Design a protein around this ligand. Structure first.
Ligand code: GQQ
Ligand code: CL
Ligand code: MG
Ligand code: MG
Ligand code: MG
Ligand code: MG
Lengths: 196, 244, 240, 241, 219, 204, 224, 243
């Protein structure tokens, strides 16, 4: 798995590969690893698919119930609910989750929750098995307040490399753009990103 | 708090009686008469249904006579729903005993168990007692044929012949008059029906107002057989004994 | 919050009466007339859809309920109490029966389970009895067609035909005259519509009457329970 | 006479605590009304802010239960909020367990089954509220379902609740007797809200300003309440024809 | 076991073989692996057969009660959730590997459910020991929005691949076609292998076996 | 160590024309040591027969448990349980111990009293139903029985033809298993008579 | 029982004449991966205490919340929350120490080594250590993990025993701490150049210094 | 009759008399008020000096919840403390899960649902306090008042206790004469005056003024007690207005 969330001028973009493997067998080659917990709060999932799915569903429930009572939750609040589940159940979970969301007040925000259950607020975050191969690349090429087209290219190039080197990653590059304008889903096929 | 509304079902009166048991017995006195008669070669259970309309489906109906296992049956007097709770508990005790010892439960042990359950409702829990009196007809290889009764107090006693429900005073005198120790099942059948025929609050005793059963060892190779009489069979035995 | 009502609210009075059961039966008496008739090749159950307002959609309020594919129930008395009995009856038919034996319970046993639930409200701590009487019609392979009544006490009786609620005394007399052991299902439906007309004041049509049957299998089996449509009732009201 | 203090039967076969909970229903002296359009369900309710010290924005008897379901309450606000919080919780749990949004009628039946429990169990009192649930259900379309302290519930073509409910009910009954349809034959919810308000004015015989009303609207995939200015625009359109 | 499913134009086609094995031995050559959840939803089962059977039955029972209370047909997402949340709770110890397919108010849906409680939503899936053989057929020949008789052939071809190439799979091919207008439960759809014909009669003649004692009891 | 093969023994059941047959060996051992040659593994609840192989304490326990359950069934239903219904009961009962199972291999056999249809079924230790028309095998020589049954069996056998088929399947399978044999019993079950025969076999 | 995942390295500290100094680098290692370069591991509590934490970062973040919550709770019905009944270093420590030992005794430890540095009401220097086992000790210099092996030897040359504390000025102590942080950066493979330092003085109060860096680095001898 | 002997019993009116009897205990208590200002809220309370032996400024009545909410109440003082203890648990569990400090409307319903729960059963007594509370959250300032029934609403100004009618009249004047709004420092002065004017209903014994406030500008959105010079300035303003 190769996943990332990147803040930019107009908000934040989440990005992910689409490969799910059982050992060397690709069980699902068109996986959707970008999952929606609220209108403009999404997460990237890595680790146990059963665990990250179970967590994401519980978070969606908590934020739905939060919204019923207290209105739209902040991205920080969503990250705190993810953290609470991951940290308190650390012994029984294998989940590495990036949380990304757009407020109008705070704009784009990215929170990463690695295996421990710790929370880290970052300008961008990378995660999953394929992330190791792009720490060098991403650190050298990331700038703050990029344009939408620059951030789409930054994620596309980064995950392209993650996919190239990691066997556990592959398939299409899905992205989810979060801005004031709304929610846009993007997809990029092998024939496009491999020739970069 | 809640104390205000508590009837206090498990207390003594100043005279040393349990109010609710006494009132449950009063309830049972209005229920249809049930009679048990023990002979040397079998037991008879006879019981009178109540209210009955022409539209009541009699052949699929069971309000009085129930089967606990292959050896033991009960005649009921009181709340039928309350009886069925206790009956299913008894049916389980019999199978628990069978599972544990690989032998059929002795009649008295089953009777004590049920009677101990009834007792419990009179001493603790704050619930109303079961408004039920049972006649237990049963056989085991220790005491042979046995009749017992239990009532809401949880007291049980053994009998040669006995009635419960309505007109027990009148019924028990008529049985005490015509019962004899050497009596046989066919005679006890006749005594049971004659007693009901005189103590009934109905104008006449007919097949549709009766449930009837016999526990005979009278079977091939000395084995106990329970016979719950069908509507047509009760009608035949009423003609045989000369009541209709 | 302590549920401090751990003691019976139904107790024997000096006369031997269980007050709350009698009062529950009084509530059933005030309820709208429902009836059941058993034919040779089926059973019919029927009741009036007493609409609380003309703005209310009485189609949404089902007085006649499917319990299993071959068992149906109707009531007289308090609707909300009926609804929660139907929920429990449906559930108990799965938990204590279908998940064990791989088949649906026979009519008599499901009746017995409902009766048990109603008995428990008559003796358990901190509850009133149910304020309904149920008429459960059903079919099973070894017992055939059957019709049962279940009272607030937990007592149940099998019937050839009967009625409960408002005009039950008059309706039962009407049924006693008309019933015989050679009725076909259509004859029983005809008698049910006649009997029910007596107790109904206002409009008498397929929209104000609810009527279901336990009959032939409607295409492992098909379900024998079938609720008659508004149109199917009106057709039989022209031959009335 | 303790048969009047808890939920047990009186000799007549009656539950007096249920009946007295129904009387608590009108203690607010507020009338609500609900109607259905083609694409929508509109609920309107009287708003009364008697104290000048009150923040009028916090005075509301309409609740957003889920995104699709709205609930207006006739009864005192503490019981209304008790019911609201539970309905919200139930709708969230439903979506989690079964993977689709709780339908309006399924919630109504659920809240009704809870209300029934208070009428049978002695330690719990009934809530002194009538709950009118509204949505545009994805299977059944525009939906109005109402629950009361008895635990009764039923679907409605339109409904009214409160002290002057009979007047509003008959007004609505008469309109649907003319049109011979189960709904307001209107494309825009804006005009269904205008209908609702107009027919309440006629029935109650009172004019309304923007601060005397409170409006909720259910559409496909969202329920929302109107602001004072949205209602004012609605009142302007009524006056101009 | 080879079970598979595809989403076609009008709905869902499910497929399964019929071999039930104990170790290396075949206990049943014609067992049913396509289970009933609701009238519009079916479930192919692989993994531990007891777990597969009881899990489908429990969720089918609970959906029946759910569907009686709501009065409307159940959805595939609710079947999926109920299976998923249960399997997850038991942390993989319930070895149920399901292909769940059905048709809703919201259209046709196909899921793969794994023992640990993960689910994928897909246009085609395969599971069991013959999943790779079956998946090869789908990667070779699948396309979206197939016609019914085409999709039937593709699934049948995918199950066949499993039957022949996987030793765990065998017997007949069962299909289940689900659309808005019908449910076709085809058992068996195909009989790809004839039962082997025996050349001799080895049955013994009466009185060949040596008896000690006998007892007859009537019923 | 392996609970299913401490005590040893086998059960086989077959269908015929308007009849079923179920048969078992008589051995009970502690691995190598033979202990009892009167340990029958076939029981009956009304007209439904149940063979049980495996760990003998569980064989006994389950027999006592199904007697219990079918007795209450009969009292409540007012009729004897049928094979199809009992099979489901067995499956349920086994699966409710999913994570601490009875180490057994049950086999149902009987004729449905109403339809007259011959019925057999088998289960794994956690209650998955093998629902085969031809034959069901269980125990330490199950492989041996599978081989014997597959070659000897054919459909629609008359009761005394079927007897010879099931008997030879049992005997020859048992003689290739160390932990089976020491005697054998064969029930030939028809709609309203049951013939129980004890077989003469080698006692090693 | 767990295993630490994202980790912080050495926390080092010492007493001087008027107060205490504590320091810790800004790194959150993920094994050999130097993952998070902006992690603050000195967490002040009021204006008289700084809690320095090494080990598991998720467990540190939990402890951070427990201390934040402790301040809130002490303020409740406490008119002297900013005066006589404010939280003391000794109170904050004893709480943590209780927690750490309770957690180890349930076989579910907070996977940390903590140094609570502060100044008490009466001007006394407070410096005490606690770890995942509930083991507690005090000394004129304290250091966790790696710093115990390399920092303590250097810091003990400034304050070798109790009688050296009054002789040590804040400048000497701060120099020693910063020097020690350099030595750790050369030799600790899981450390970073960027660190935070905190001085808690009885006169000048709490001084918290962020974004410090190791400098004056001798590499020139490498070329040969 | 007998409908007033048990909590959670509906009278034939539809009323819960035990709740209305709890209100009588509230009406019997000392005067407490709340004033919503531009960027915050101000709370003030009348503390009756029963005796000269009471230590001045020590028996504090206003309580803080979390760091941003102030609570004050009239009636049975222990019942008010019990409710605040619960509020603190609610505010803590909210922040534990959702990270952000509890919003005031969210917090208001937490108290509301709990107080309402004590009108649902005969095994508990209703709360003998009306509670005025509020603070500053992300959506600005909020003032609430919560009655024994579980009823609560948002307020511009609020008042409860024995001097509530006197206070309410004064609060209504401020609402009319300041539609653009009242400043935090103004609201502190006005709070002092209103407690002094509302003291005519408890005029037998002399009293002690206690004021607190949250304001986005004046206290950084945190609850603080008005102490020292600012308190004395408010007392002087109040003393001048009565004379
Ligand atoms: C194929 C699944 S596979 C090997 O992973 O591809 C098949 C699926 C199946 C079979 C039958 C049904 C009927 N309900 C549904 C689905 N599963 C089997 O053949 C299993 C495979 C085992 C679990 C690996 N076999 C069994 O479950 C058998 C019992 C059957 C023959 C009645 N049980 C065991 O092998 C066994 C062994 N030890 C302990 C428990 N069970
Ligand atoms: Cl419910
Ligand atoms: Mg790759
Ligand atoms: Mg009550
Ligand atoms: Mg041998
Ligand atoms: Mg031997």
């Amino acid at each position: 798995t190769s996943i990332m969330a990147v803040t930019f001028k107009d908000g934040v973009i989440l990005g992910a590969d689409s490969r799910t493997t059982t050992g060397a067998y690709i069980a699902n080659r068109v996986t959707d690893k970008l999952t929606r917990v609220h209108d403009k709060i999404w997460c990237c999932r890595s680790g146990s698919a059963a665990d990250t799915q179970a967590i994401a569903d519980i978070v969606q429930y908590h934020l739905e119930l939060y919204t019923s009572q207290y209105g739209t939750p902040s991205t920080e609040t969503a990250a705190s609910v993810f953290k609470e589940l991951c940290y308190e159940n650390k012994d029984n979970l294998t989940a590495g989750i990036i949380v990304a969301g757009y407020d109008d007040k705070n704009k784009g925000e990215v929170y990463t929750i690695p295996l421990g259950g710790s929370v880290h607020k970052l300008p961008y975050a990378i995660a999953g098995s394929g992330s190791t191969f792009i720490y060098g690349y991403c650190d050298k090429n990331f700038r703050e307040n990029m344009s939408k087209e620059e951030t789409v290219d930054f994620i596309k190039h980064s995950l392209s490399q993650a996919i190239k080197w990691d066997g556990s990653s592959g398939g299409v590059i899905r992205m989810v753009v979060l801005t004031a304008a709304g929610v846009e889903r993007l997809i990029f096929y092998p024939d496009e990103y491999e020739q970069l | 708090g809640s104390r205000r509304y508590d009837s206090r079902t498990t207390i003594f009166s100043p005279e040393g009686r349990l109010y609710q048991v006494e009132y449950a017995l009063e309830s049972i006195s209005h229920a249809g008469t049930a009679i048990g008669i023990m002979a040397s070669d079998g037991i008879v259970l006879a019981a009178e249904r109540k209210v009955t309309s022409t539209l009541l489906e009699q052949d699929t109906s069971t309000e009085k006579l129930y089967k606990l296992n292959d050896k033991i049956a009960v005649a009921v007097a009181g709340l039928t729903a309350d009886a069925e709770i206790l009956i299913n508990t008894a049916r389980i005790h019999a199978q628990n005993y069978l599972k544990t010892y690989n032998e059929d439960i002795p009649v008295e042990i089953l009777v004590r168990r049920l009677s101990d359950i009834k007792q419990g409702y009179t001493q603790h829990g704050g619930l109303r007692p079961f408004g039920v009196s049972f006649i237990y007809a049963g056989y085991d290889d220790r005491y042979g044929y046995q009749l017992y009764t239990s009532n809401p107090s949880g007291n049980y006693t053994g009998w040669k012949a006995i009635s419960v429900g309505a007109n027990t005073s009148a019924a028990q005198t008529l049985l005490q008059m015509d019962y004899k120790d050497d009596m046989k099942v066919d005679d006890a059948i006749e005594l049971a029906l004659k007693t009901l025929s005189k103590t009934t609050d109905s104008s006449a005793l007919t097949y549709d107002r009766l449930e009837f059963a016999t526990i005979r060892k009278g079977a091939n190779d000395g084995e106990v057989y329970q016979k719950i009489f069908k509507p047509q069979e009760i009608k035949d035995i009423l003609v045989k004994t000369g009541i209709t | 919050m302590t549920d401090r009502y751990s003691f019976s609210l139904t107790t024997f009075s000096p006369s031997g009466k269980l007050g709350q059961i009698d009062y529950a039966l009084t509530a059933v008496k005030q309820g709208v007339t429902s009836l059941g008739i058993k034919a040779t090749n089926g059973v019919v159950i029927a009741t009036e859809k007493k609409s609380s307002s003309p703005l209310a959609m009485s189609e949404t309020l089902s007085k006649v309920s499917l319990l299993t594919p071959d068992i149906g129930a109707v009531y007289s008395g308090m609707g909300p109490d009926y609804r929660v009995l139907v929920d429990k009856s449906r559930k108990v038919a799965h938990t204590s029966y279908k998940r064990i034996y791989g088949e649906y319970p026979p009519t008599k046993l499901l009746v017995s389970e409902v009766a048990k639930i109603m008995q428990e409200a008559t003796q358990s701590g901190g509850v009133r009895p149910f304020g309904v009487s149920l008429l459960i019609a059903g079919h099973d392979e070894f017992n055939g067609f059957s019709l049962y009544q279940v009272d607030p006490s937990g007592s149940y009786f099998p019937w050839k035909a009967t009625a409960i609620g408002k005009g039950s005394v008059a309706a039962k007399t009407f049924l006693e005259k008309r019933w015989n052991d050679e009725l076909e299902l259509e004859d029983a439906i005809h008698i049910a519509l006649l009997t029910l007309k007596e107790s109904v004041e206002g409009e008498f049509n397929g929209d104000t009457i609810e009527l279901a049957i336990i009959g032939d299998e409607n295409p492992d089996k098909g379900p024998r329970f079938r609720k008659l449509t508004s149109q199917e009732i009106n057709d039989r009201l022209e031959a009335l | 006479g303790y048969d009047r203090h808890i939920t047990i039967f009186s000799p007549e076969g009656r539950l007096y605590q249920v009946e007295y909970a129904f009387k608590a229903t009108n203690q607010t002296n507020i009338n609500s009304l609900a109607v259905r359009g083609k694409d929508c369900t509109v609920v309107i309710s009287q708003k009364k802010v008697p104290d000048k010290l009150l923040d009028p924005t916090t005075v509301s008897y309409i609740f957003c239960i889920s995104r699709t379901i709205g609930m207006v309450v006739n009864g005192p606000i503490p019981d209304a909020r008790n019911a609201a919080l539970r309905a919200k919780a139930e709708a969230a749990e439903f979506r989690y367990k079964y993977g689709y949004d709780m339908p309006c009628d399924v919630l109504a039946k659920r809240m009704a089954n809870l209300s029934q429990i208070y009428t049978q169990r002695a330690y719990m009192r009934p809530l002194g509220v009538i709950l009118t649930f509204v949505s545009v259900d994805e299977e059944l379309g525009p939906s109005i379902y109402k629950t009361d302290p008895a635990g009764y519930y039923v679907g409605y073509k339109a409904t009214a609740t409160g002290p002057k409910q009979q007047e509003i009910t008959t007004n609505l009954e008469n309109h649907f007797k003319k049109s011979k349809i189960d709904h307001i034959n209107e494309e825009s919810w804006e005009k269904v809200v205008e209908f609702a308000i107009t027919h309440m004015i006629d029935a109650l015989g009172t004019e309304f300003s923007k601060n005397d009303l409170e409006v909720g609207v259910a559409t496909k995939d969202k329920f929302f309440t109107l602001s004072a200015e949205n209602i004012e625009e609605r009142l302007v359109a009524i006056a101009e024809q | 076991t080879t079970i598979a499913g595809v989403v076609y134009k009008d709905g869902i086609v499910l497929g399964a073989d019929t071999r039930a094995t104990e170790g290396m031995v075949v206990a049943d050559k014609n067992c049913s692996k396509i289970h009933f959840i609701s009238p519009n939803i079916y479930c192919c089962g692989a993994g531990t057969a007891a777990d597969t059977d009881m899990t489908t039955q429990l969720i089918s029972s609970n959906l029946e009660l759910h569907s009686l209370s709501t009065g409307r047909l159940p959805r595939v997402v609710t079947a999926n959730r109920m299976l998923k949340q249960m399997l997850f709770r038991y942390q993989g110890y319930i070895g149920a590997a399901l292909v769940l397919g059905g048709v809703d108010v919201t259209g046709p849906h196909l899921y793969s459910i794994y023992p640990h409680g993960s689910t994928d939503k897909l246009p085609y899936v395969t599971m069991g020991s013959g999943s790779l053989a079956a998946m090869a057929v789908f990667e070779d020949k699948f396309r979206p929005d197939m016609e019914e008789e085409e999709a039937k052939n593709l699934v049948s071809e995918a199950i066949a691949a499993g039957i022949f190439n996987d030793l765990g799979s065998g017997g007949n091919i069962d299909l289940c076609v689900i659309s808005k207008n019908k449910l076709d439960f085809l058992r068996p759809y195909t009989v790809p292998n004839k039962k082997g014909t025996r050349l001799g009669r080895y049955r013994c003649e009466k009185g060949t076996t040596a008896v000690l004692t006998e007892k007859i009891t009537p019923l | 160590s392996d609970p299913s093969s401490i005590n040893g023994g086998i059960v086989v059941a077959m269908t015929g024309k308007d009849c079923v047959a179920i048969a078992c060996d008589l051995r009970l051992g502690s691995q190598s040591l033979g202990v009892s040659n009167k340990f029958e593994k076939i029981f009956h609840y009304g007209h439904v027969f149940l063979g049980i192989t495996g760990l003998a304490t569980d064989v006994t326990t389950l027999n006592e448990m199904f007697r219990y359950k079918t007795n209450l069934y009969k009292l409540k239903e007012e009729r004897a349980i049928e094979p199809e219904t009992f099979t489901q009961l067995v499956s349920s009962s086994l699966y409710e111990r999913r994570f601490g199972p009875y180490f057994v291999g049950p086999v149902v056999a009987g004729i449905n009293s109403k339809s007259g249809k011959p019925f057999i079924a088998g289960f794994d230790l956690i209650g998955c139903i093998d629902e085969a028309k031809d034959f069901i095998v269980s125990g330490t020589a199950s492989d041996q029985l599978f081989g014997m049954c597959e070659s000897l069996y054919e459909p629609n056998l008359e009761p005394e033809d079927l007897f010879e088929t099931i008997s030879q399947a049992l005997l020859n399978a048992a003689d290739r298993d160390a932990l089976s044999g020491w005697g054998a019993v064969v029930y030939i079950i028809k709609k309203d008579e049951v013939v129980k025969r004890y077989l003469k076999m080698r006692q090693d | 029982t767990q295993q630490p995942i994202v980790t912080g390295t050495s926390v080092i500290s010492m007493k001087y004449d008027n107060g205490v100094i504590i320091a810790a680098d800004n790194l959150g290692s993920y094994g050999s991966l130097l993952r998070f370069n902006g992690v603050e591991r000195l967490i002040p509590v009021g204006d008289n205490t700084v809690v320095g934490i090494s080990g598991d970062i998720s467990d540190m973040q939990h402890i951070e919340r427990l201390l934040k919550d402790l301040v809130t709770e002490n303020a409740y019905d406490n008119p002297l929350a900013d005066a006589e009944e404010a939280l003391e270093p000794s109170y904050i420590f004893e709480y943590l120490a209780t927690v750490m030992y309770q957690r180890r005794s349930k076989m579910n430890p907070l996977w940390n080594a903590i140094i609570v540095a502060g100044v008490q009401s009466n001007g006394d220097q407070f410096l005490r250590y606690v770890n995942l086992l509930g083991v507690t000790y005090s000394s004129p210099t304290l250091a966790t993990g790696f710093g115990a092996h390399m920092a303590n030897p250097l810091l003990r040359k400034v304050v070798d025993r109790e009688s050296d504390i009054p002789k040590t000025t804040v400048q000497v102590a701060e120099e020693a701490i910063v020097n020690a942080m350099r030595v750790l950066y050369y030799r600790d493979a899981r450390s970073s150049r960027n660190f935070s330092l905190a001085i808690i003085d009885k006169n000048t109060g709490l001084t918290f210094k962020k974004n410090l860096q190791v400098e004056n680095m001798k590499w020139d001898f490498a070329k040969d | 009759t007998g409908y007033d002997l048990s909590n959670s019993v509906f009278s034939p009116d539809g009323r819960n008399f035990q709740v209305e009897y709890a209100v009588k205990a509230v009406e019997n208590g000392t005067t407490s008020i709340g004033i919503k200002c531009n960027d915050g809220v101000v709370f003030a309370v009348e503390k009756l000096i029963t005796s000269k032996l009471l230590v001045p400024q020590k028996n504090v009545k206003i309580q803080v919840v979390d760091r941003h909410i102030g609570c004050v109440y009239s009636g049975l003082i222990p019942d008010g403390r019990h409710l605040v203890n619960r509020g603190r648990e609610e505010a803590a569990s909210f922040k534990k899960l959702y990270k952000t400090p509890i919003p005031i409307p969210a917090f208001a319903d937490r108290l509301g649902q709990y107080v309402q729960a004590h009108t649902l059963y005969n095994s508990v007594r209703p709360f003998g306090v009306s509670t005025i509370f509020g603070g500053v959250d992300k959506n600005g300032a909020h003032l609430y008042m919560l009655e024994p029934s579980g009823s609560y609403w948002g307020y511009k100004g609020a008042a409860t206790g024995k001097g509530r009618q006197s206070a309410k009249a004064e609060l209504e004047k401020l609402v009319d004469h300041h539609p653009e709004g009242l400043s935090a420092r103004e609201a502190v002065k006005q709070a002092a005056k209103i407690i002094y004017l509302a003291h005519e209903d408890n005029k037998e014994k002399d009293f002690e003024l206690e004021i607190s406030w949250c304001s986005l500008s004046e206290t950084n959105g945190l609850h603080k007690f008005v102490k020292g010079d600012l308190l004395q300035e408010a007392i002087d303003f109040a003393q001048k207005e009565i004379n």
